[PDB]
Amino acid sequence: GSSGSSGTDPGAEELPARIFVALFDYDPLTMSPNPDAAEEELPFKEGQIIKVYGDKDADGFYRGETCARLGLIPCNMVSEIQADDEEMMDQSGPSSG
Template sequence: GYRDRRHSPPYYDESEQEDPFRIFVALFDYDPLSMSPNPDAADEELPFKEGQIIKVYGDKDNDGFYRGEIRGRCGLIPCNMVSEIRAEDDETMEQLMKQGFLPLNTP
């Protein structure tokens, strides 16, 4: 919105400013080559393992895919295979990103 504008400098340094993203976790293993609903696009999708932390940018598209990033690789993520994590604070988020995995089988 408008009110944020005056706080940010008129230009920004690429390294400083990042797209807002949300943190998701993979609920299942996913291999696009064998599991993708549209095999033609399988190479645009990211494979992942259950418990893997995924950065997601923006909202899902009409096909139900998010634009996401895993370990620096960008691609499409099927929305029904992942779930959003709400981190308590930035520190928790940093920690999760560092680990790259969420232990799902903890009580």
């Protein structure tokens, strides 16, 4: 339909989905040793966001959703993004407590 990555402005709250950015282009169609097993993998270009849901299985793959797609993401390729919320307190003022 219409829903997907973006479009439906945020109205209510939802489950926490770890955001992971792609470090390099991933092609499970050519990279993967087999296409059949490649289906389980989730392709993504560098700089692409992947709504990761949960942790990674033994293999070490993060199951996330990107571009209205679902599959496995190689924790090796992608990476964790920095926190958006207020950052830690650095150089705490000299003021006395």
